Each structure stands twice: as structure tokens, then as C-alpha cells.
Amino acid sequence: VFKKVLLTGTSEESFTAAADDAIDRAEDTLDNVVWAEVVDQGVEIGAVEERTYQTEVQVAFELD
Amino acid sequence: VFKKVLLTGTSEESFTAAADDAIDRAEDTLDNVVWAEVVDQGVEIGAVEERTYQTEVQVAFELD
Amino acid sequence: VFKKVLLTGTSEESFTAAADDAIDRAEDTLDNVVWAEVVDQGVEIGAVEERTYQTEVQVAFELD
Amino acid sequence: VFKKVLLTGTSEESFTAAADDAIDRAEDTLDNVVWAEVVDQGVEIGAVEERTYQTEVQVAFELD
Amino acid sequence: VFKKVLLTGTSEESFTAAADDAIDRAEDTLDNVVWAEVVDQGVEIGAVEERTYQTEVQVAFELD
Amino acid sequence: VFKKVLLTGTSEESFTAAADDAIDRAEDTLDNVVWAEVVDQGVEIGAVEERTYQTEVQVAFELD
Amino acid sequence: VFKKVLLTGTSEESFTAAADDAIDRAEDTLDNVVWAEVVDQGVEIGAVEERTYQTEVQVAFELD
Amino acid sequence: VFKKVLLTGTSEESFTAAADDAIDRAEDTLDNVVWAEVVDQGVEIGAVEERTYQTEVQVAFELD
Amino acid sequence: VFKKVLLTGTSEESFTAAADDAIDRAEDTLDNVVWAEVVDQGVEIGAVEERTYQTEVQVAFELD
Amino acid sequence: VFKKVLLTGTSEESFTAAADDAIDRAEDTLDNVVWAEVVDQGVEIGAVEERTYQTEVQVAFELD
Amino acid sequence: VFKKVLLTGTSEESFTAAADDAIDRAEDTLDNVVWAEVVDQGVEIGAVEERTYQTEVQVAFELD
Amino acid sequence: VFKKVLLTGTSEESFTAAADDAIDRAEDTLDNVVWAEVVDQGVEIGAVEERTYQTEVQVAFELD
Numbered sequence: 161v162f163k164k165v166l167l168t169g170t171s172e173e174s175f176t177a178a179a180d181d182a183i184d185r186a187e188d189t190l191d192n193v194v195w196a197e198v199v200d201q202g203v204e205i206g207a208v209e210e211r212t213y214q215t216e217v218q219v220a221f222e223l224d
Numbered sequence: 225v226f227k228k229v230l231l232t233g234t235s236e237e238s239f240t241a242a243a244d245d246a247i248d249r250a251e252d253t254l255d256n257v258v259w260a261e262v263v264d265q266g267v268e269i270g271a272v273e274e275r276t277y278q279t280e281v282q283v284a285f286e287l288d
Numbered sequence: 289v290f291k292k293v294l295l296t297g298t299s300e301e302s303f304t305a306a307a308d309d310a311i312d313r314a315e316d317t318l319d320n321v322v323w324a325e326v327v328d329q330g331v332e333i334g335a336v337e338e339r340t341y342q343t344e345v346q347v348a349f350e351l352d
Numbered sequence: 353v354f355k356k357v358l359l360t361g362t363s364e365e366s367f368t369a370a371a372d373d374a375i376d377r378a379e380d381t382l383d384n385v386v387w388a389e390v391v392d393q394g395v396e397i398g399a400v401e402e403r404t405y406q407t408e409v410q411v412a413f414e415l416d
Numbered sequence: 417v418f419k420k421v422l423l424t425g426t427s428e429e430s431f432t433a434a435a436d437d438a439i440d441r442a443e444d445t446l447d448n449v450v451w452a453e454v455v456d457q458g459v460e461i462g463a464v465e466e467r468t469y470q471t472e473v474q475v476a477f478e479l480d
Numbered sequence: 481v482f483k484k485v486l487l488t489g490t491s492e493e494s495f496t497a498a499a500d501d502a503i504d505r506a507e508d509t510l511d512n513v514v515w516a517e518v519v520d521q522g523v524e525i526g527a528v529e530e531r532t533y534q535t536e537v538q539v540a541f542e543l544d
Numbered sequence: 545v546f547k548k549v550l551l552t553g554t555s556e557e558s559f560t561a562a563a564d565d566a567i568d569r570a571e572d573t574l575d576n577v578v579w580a581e582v583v584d585q586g587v588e589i590g591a592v593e594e595r596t597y598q599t600e601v602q603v604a605f606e607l608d
Numbered sequence: 609v610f611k612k613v614l615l616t617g618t619s620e621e622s623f624t625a626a627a628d629d630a631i632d633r634a635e636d637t638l639d640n641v642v643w644a645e646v647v648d649q650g651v652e653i654g655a656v657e658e659r660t661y662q663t664e665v666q667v668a669f670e671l672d
Numbered sequence: 673v674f675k676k677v678l679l680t681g682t683s684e685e686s687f688t689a690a691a692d693d694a695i696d697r698a699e700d701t702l703d704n705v706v707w708a709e710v711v712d713q714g715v716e717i718g719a720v721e722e723r724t725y726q727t728e729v730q731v732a733f734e735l736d
Numbered sequence: 737v738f739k740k741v742l743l744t745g746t747s748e749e750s751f752t753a754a755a756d757d758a759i760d761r762a763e764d765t766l767d768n769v770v771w772a773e774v775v776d777q778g779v780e781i782g783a784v785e786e787r788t789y790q791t792e793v794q795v796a797f798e799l800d
Numbered sequence: 801v802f803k804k805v806l807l808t809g810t811s812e813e814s815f816t817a818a819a820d821d822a823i824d825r826a827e828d829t830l831d832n833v834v835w836a837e838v839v840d841q842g843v844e845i846g847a848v849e850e851r852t853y854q855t856e857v858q859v860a861f862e863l864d
Numbered sequence: 865v866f867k868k869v870l871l872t873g874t875s876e877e878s879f880t881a882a883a884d885d886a887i888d889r890a891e892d893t894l895d896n897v898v899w900a901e902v903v904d905q906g907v908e909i910g911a912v913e914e915r916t917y918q919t920e921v922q923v924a925f926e927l928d
């Protein structure tokens with residue numbers, strides 16, 4: 161059985177690095193992370209000093 | 225990193241109050257709740273005594 | 289077996305009351321109405337004297 | 353010919369009042385506003401003192 | 417309030433049995449599981465000895 | 481001209497048998513049923529004694 | 545209250561004439577037909593002597 | 609950089625002529641119109657003397 | 673078994689004729705073409721001397 | 737690099753067997769078939785003697 | 801009230817730089833740009849000397 | 865007439881380089897490749913030694 165958690169990673173550099181930021185977080189607390197699906201991408205502009213790229217992913221991990 | 229949980233709130237009064245019911249629940253157990261996105265709305269009729277409005281939201285919270 | 293009919297209710301007050309307007313109509317002529325799913329919402333402005341909220345629902349009812 | 357502008361209204365009270373907030377703004381600067389279609393709804397929580405309901409609409413107006 | 421978890425069940429027999437595999441898992445660790453919605457189906461071919469049917473479901477459970 | 485009716489069939493056995501349950505019902509009361517399109521599938525768990533598979537179909541029939 | 549019926553019109557000439565074929569049928573049996581929304585278009589090739597254009601519409605009519 | 613404006617053209621003749629009606633309007637006031645994408649089509653019936661075909665397009669134009 | 677190929681036809685006259693242009697091409701090289709589904713429509717303006725209507729179709733054909 | 741082909745399998749028994757019918761066909765002529773994604777399901781009723789279940793899949797295979 | 805404009809940025813380097821190209825343009829002529837949502841990405845190949853990455857964004861800005 | 869093939873490119877570096885990997889492959893065997901549309905992006909984690917970015921594109925090419 162796989163389960164997915166819906167995480168948004170951020171990066172001041174690129175959409176790929178923002179996807180890695182969410183995946184790194186999932187791998188800090190979950191075992192058996194096996195793939196991630198990008199579901200949304202965007203850029204935060206008016207709440208930050210530098211534009212921040214955001215990449216939202218479903219991160220799938222195999223249970224037990 | 226943000227994470228989202230997918231909750232359906234209910235209200236006998238309105239779709240806005242059913243969204244607040246899910247958000248209130250998220251805020252009882254999570255810290256740093258920052259926004260919610262409505263993904264579905266509906267009305268339960270044939271299992272209740274009063275119509276019950278349901279509003280399903282992804283509730284986003286900032287991790288650590 | 290459930291069947292659904294696709295109805296748009298209207299209200300000069302709110303999207304929740306426009307959903308109830310469609311459901312009230314379904315319950316006037318159908319038996320065993322059991323739930324409704326909101327599929328669209330909008331506001332009529334330039335054909336009315338007061339803005340009219342419209343909420344389109346699939347209204348499900350159990351057959352026999 | 354109709355044209356649409358994509359506006360997000362806000363309200364501390366309800367999703368219906370947030371739709372009216374966008375429509376009121378369109379009617380301040382455009383003539384012949386004729387209908388609005390709701391395309392998204394959400395709630396801002398972690399950047400405000402009171403939850404703020406947001407309702408995003410395409411607001412259609414007839415040209416000339 | 418309902419919450420949903422996004423699980424993918426697997427079966428070497430059918431898409432219905434792969435949906436039951438995810439639901440069985442949810443029922444091992446959650447109380448008050450009340451319904452599941454199928455969101456995706458697929459077949460793993462080139463990483464297994466027998467084709468494996470996969471059925472991804474949102475499994476809803478009532479909170480407290 | 482074809483018309484479609486939106487029916488949800490149920491089965492305690494499989495998603496295919498739940499699609500046949502809706503189609504059987506359409507064929508009891510309509511003539512010239514010609515095809516059905518699956519639009520949604522789900523499983524009722526917390527209102528029944530046995531899980532019930534549900535398959536929602538648009539059932540098309542040729543008019544006159 | 546508006547209700548919609550889901551009809552597919554056909555024409556050997558064009559997608560516009562196939563939409564009119566469904567609307568003509570709705571107007572033969574319903575009163576107060578007020579608008580139609582195109583939801584799908586296609587062409588039947590291998591079951592006919594001439595290609596047949598098909599245009600599927602939700603045809604809305606005002607109730608009473 | 610391209611920008612798009614969302615326009616609905618109308619015609620009493622066909623969906624193609626209603627798309628041209630929106631594009632003609634865009635070309636009256638914008639320079640460098642380069643392509644249009646159809647996003648919706650429908651037919652106004654109960655507010656007109658003749659059916660009016662409507663074709664909604666995103667009309668893209670190159671900026672400067 | 674059916675297979676589909678994804679083709680975009682073009683016409684300087686109409687969206688129906690652009691769908692026929694893709695279907696004519698499929699029928700020049702494939703046997704047993706049985707139906708086509710329209711998936712997208714658009715108009716090329718800024719790369720041509722006359723507007724060119726484009727209609728993208730999945731063209732289905734029965735295998736062997 | 738993976739490529740996908742869009743095939744519809746058929747079965748008089750079930751949606752799972754109709755998915756296997758498309759996959760079996762892909763495996764007769766392609767090497768390195770690695771997974772399939774279900775994209776649509778339906779039932780042919782009015783052109784056959786027995787209902788025929790149809791399951792449309794994108795069948796992915798690794799190139800070289 | 802927020803308004804969004806739909807812009808496509810281009811870059812010969814990456815999808816992230818093409819998103820920044822649209823955002824830079826919006827910030828040259830609008831005040832209070834606050835976030836952008838990616839809605840589409842693609843690559844122009846056969847009209848250019850170098851591949852050009854294109855990233856289409858809704859760029860939101862707060863009104864007054 | 866344009867035709868599209870559905871390819872998934874991979875890269876250990878970025879989503880842009882994974883899109884180029886699919887396009888490079890299409891250009892090795894097809895003539896007149898003219899544009900590609902991104903339809904999906906994801907990251908393979910649990911079957912590789914380094915994360916692999918995957919970008920799925922419809923690659924369009926002009927026929928003859």
C-alpha cells in the first residue's frame with residue numbers, strides 16, 4: 161500500500177530546487193519515499209525580499 | 225515547507241460556516257495554519273434531520 | 289440505484305440559499321432526495337434589478 | 353462581444369460577500385457588467401487578524 | 417468533521433480488490449472509516465513478476 | 481439525437497457489477513440504451529453491513 | 545430554478561448544425577429553453593455512410 | 609512576452625464566425641494578435657430573436 | 673482493441689473542416705478509422721496570411 | 737525516455753480484463769512495456785450481443 | 801481586491817527563467833504584484849534558432 | 865496536419881533538462897518537430913541512486 165502526503169517546497173533558485181525542498185523534508189521523517197508528482201507551481205513575490213519559487217508535490221511512500 | 229490536510233467541515237447554516245468548522249478543527253491540533261483552499265461543496269439531505277452544508281478544504285500549515 | 293438531476297437554484301441573498309432553492313424544488317417533485325453536489329456558482333447582474341446568486345447542484349435521489 | 357476580468361474579492365463575513373466585493377470593484381470602473389462566474393474560493397488565516405474569505409470570479413462585461 | 421487520507425492499494429487480481437487493499441489498511445489503523453472515492457487506477461507491469469492492479473482512493477473517516 | 485441520464489449503480493461484489501446495476505435499471509425503463517460512460521467510482525463503508533461498490537455512469541439512449 | 549438535460553445532436557454538415565439538432569429536439573418537448581452549453585464534440589466515421597458530426601450540449605430550461 | 613485577453617464573440621451563423629467576431633474585436637484595438645485558443649462554446653436561445661452562437665477565446669498578442 | 677492517434681487538422685474555412693482535414697489524413701494511412709473526439713480548437717493569426725482554424729482530434733481506429 | 741500509446745481494450749467480463757486486453761496487445765508488438773494508466777472506462781450496449789466493457793489506458797514503454 | 805493578468809514569459813535557459821520573464825514584465829508596469837500561479841509550460845522548437853522555454857502564469861496584483 | 869507523440873524525458877539535473885531529453889529523442893527520429901507541451905512532471909526517488917526528474921511532453925511535428 162502507498163500513501164501520499166501533499167507538501168509545498170520553496171526555493172529562491174528554481175522550481176526543481178523547490179520540489180527537492182519538499183522531498184528532502186518528507187525523507188527526514190518518512191521511510192520508503194518512492195516518488196513525487198508535481199501538482200502545482202507558483203512564485204511568492206509580495207511577501208518576501210527575494211522571489212520564492214514554490215512547487216507543490218504529492219510525495220508517495222510505501223507503507224510498513 | 226507547507227503541508228496540507230484534506231478536511232470536510234459541516235454546518236447546518238452555510239457553506240462559509242462549514243469551511244470554518246474544518247478550519248477550527250485544524251487549528252485545535254496544528255500550529256501555524258496559514259490558509260485553506262475550497263475544493264468541493266455539497267449538502268447532506270437524506271441522512272440528517274436538518275440539511276447539513278459540507279465544505280471540503282485543503283488546510284495548509286507551515287512546517288516546524 | 290441513485291439518479292441525479294442537474295438544477296440551478298437562485299437567491300437574492302447567498303450562494304447557500306441558491307443551493308437550497310434547487311434542493312427545495314427537487315423535494316417538491318421527487319421522493320427520497322438524499323444529497324446534492326455543488327458543481328458551479330455565479331451571479332446574474334445585467335438582466336436583474338438586484339444581483340441574483342446562482343448555485344448549480346447535481347441533486348441525487350434513490351430510485352423506487 | 354463580452355470580455356472578462358479575473359478578480360478576487362475578500363470579506364471577513366462570507367464567500368457570497370467576497371464575490372460581491374470583486375463585483376462592486378468591477379462596477380466602479382467598468383460599464384455594462386452583466387454576470388460573474390465563481391472560479392475559486394479560499395480563506396486567508398495566517399496573514400490577517402480575522403479570517404478573510406476570498407472568492408475569485410471572472411466578471412463579464414459587454415463591450416462598447 | 418471528516419478527514420481523508422490518499423492511499424494506493426494493490427492486487428494481482430482486479431481494480432476492485434486493489435481498492436479493498438487500501439481500505440483494509442485504513443481500517444487497521446483508523447476508526448470510523450466511512451467511504452472511499454476512487455481517484456486513479458493503473459497497472460504495474462515492468463517492475464513485477466505478475467501484473468499488479470493499483471487503485472488509488474481518498475479514504476474518508478469521521479474525526480473523534 | 482441521444483440523451484444521457486446520470487445513474488449510480490451499487491454492488492457488494494465489484495465496480496463492474498455496480499456499473500451493470502445502473503445499466504440494468506436504465507434498460508428496465510428506457511428503450512434504445514446504446515452505451516454508458518463511467519464518470520466516478522467509490523465505496524460506501526460506514527453506512528452498510530458489507531462494503532458496497534458504487535459506479536456512477538452517464539447512460540446514453542437514442543431518442544424515438 | 546433552471547434544469548439542464550444532456551443531449552447529443554448529430555448533423556452530416558457541421559458541429560454548429562449538430563448543436564442545433566439537439567436544441568431543436570429540446571424545444572419540441574420543453575418549454576422555456578433558455579441556453580445550451582457545449583460539453584463535447586466528435587465525429588462518427590465507421591458506423592455511417594457519411595461522416596456524422598456530433599455535438600453534445602447541456603440544454604437549460606426555466607422551470608414552471 | 610505574450611498576454612491573453614478573454615473574449616466571447618457572438619454570431620447568428622456558426623461557432624467559427626463567433627470565434628472570428630472576438631478575434632476581429634481584439635485586432636481593432638491591439639497590435640500583434642498572434643493566436644486564439646477556444647475555451648468554451650454555447651448558444652443563447654431565450655434572450656434573443658434568433659439563436660446566437662457564442663465562442664469564448666483567449667486571444668494572445670505579443671507585447672511591445 | 674482500438675488505438676488513437678492525436679492529430680491537429682487545419683482549414684482556412686471552419687473548425688468542422690479542420691477536424692475533417694485531420695480525419696482525411698488518418699484515413700490516407702490507416703485502416704478501420706471508426707471515430708474521432710475533438711480535444712482542442714484554436715486559430716492561428718500571426719504566422720499566416722489568412723486566419724487558419726485548427727481542430728485537434730483523437731482519431732480512433734480498430735486494430736488488425 | 738518513455739513513450740505512451742493510447743489503447744482501448746474490451747472484455748465481455750470486467751473493466752480489469754478490458755485493461756489486460758489492451759496491455760496484452762501492446763506486449764505483442766512492443767518491448768519493455770513498464771506500466772499502464774487508466775484514462776477512461778465505458779460499456780458498449782447497443783452495437784453488441786453481450787455488453788462489452790471497455791477500458792482505455794496509456795501504455796508506457798521504455799525506449800531502445 | 802486582487803486582479804490577475806495572464807502572461808506567457810519566454811527564456812532560452814529554463815522554465816523558471818521564463819516564469820521570471822513574465823513576472824519582470826508585470827512588475828515594469830503594475831504596482832503591488834504579489835504572486836504568480838503557473839498555468840501552462842511548453843517549448844517552441846520549429847520557429848526559433850534556439851529552443852525557447854515558455855511558462856504561462858496568472859500574475860496577481862493588489863488593486864489601488 | 866500536426867501529429868503529437870507523448871514522451872517522458874528524464875534528467876538527474878532539472879525539469880527543463882528532462883523536457884529537453886524527450887525533445888532530443890523526438891528530433892533523432894522525426895522530422896519537422898515544431899513545439900512541445902508539458903503535460904506532467906514528477907521525480908523518481910525509490911528506484912534510482914540519484915533522484916531523477918521526469919517531464920512528460922506532447923511533442924508536435926508537422927506531417928510530410
Ligand SMILES: [Cl-]
Nearest residue numbers: 166230422474
Ligand atoms: Cl490530496
Ligand SMILES: [Cl-]
Nearest residue numbers: 294486550602
Ligand atoms: Cl450531467
Ligand SMILES: [Cl-]
Nearest residue numbers: 358614806858
Ligand atoms: Cl483567465
Ligand SMILES: [Cl-]
Nearest residue numbers: 678742870922
Ligand atoms: Cl494522448
Ligand SMILES: [Mg+2]
Nearest residue numbers: 171172173210
Ligand atoms: Mg540566490
Ligand SMILES: [Mg+2]
Nearest residue numbers: 200201202216
Ligand atoms: Mg496551489
Ligand SMILES: [Mg+2]
Nearest residue numbers: 235236237274
Ligand atoms: Mg439552525
Ligand SMILES: [Mg+2]
Nearest residue numbers: 264265266280
Ligand atoms: Mg466531495
Ligand SMILES: [Mg+2]
Nearest residue numbers: 299300301338
Ligand atoms: Mg434581499
Ligand SMILES: [Mg+2]
Nearest residue numbers: 328329330344
Ligand atoms: Mg454554469
Ligand SMILES: [Mg+2]
Nearest residue numbers: 363364365402
Ligand atoms: Mg465581522
Ligand SMILES: [Mg+2]
Nearest residue numbers: 392393394408
Ligand atoms: Mg486560487
Ligand SMILES: [Mg+2]
Nearest residue numbers: 427428429466
Ligand atoms: Mg493470482
Ligand SMILES: [Mg+2]
Nearest residue numbers: 456457458472
Ligand atoms: Mg496516479
Ligand SMILES: [Mg+2]
Nearest residue numbers: 491492493530
Ligand atoms: Mg457477496
Ligand SMILES: [Mg+2]
Nearest residue numbers: 520521522536
Ligand atoms: Mg461521486
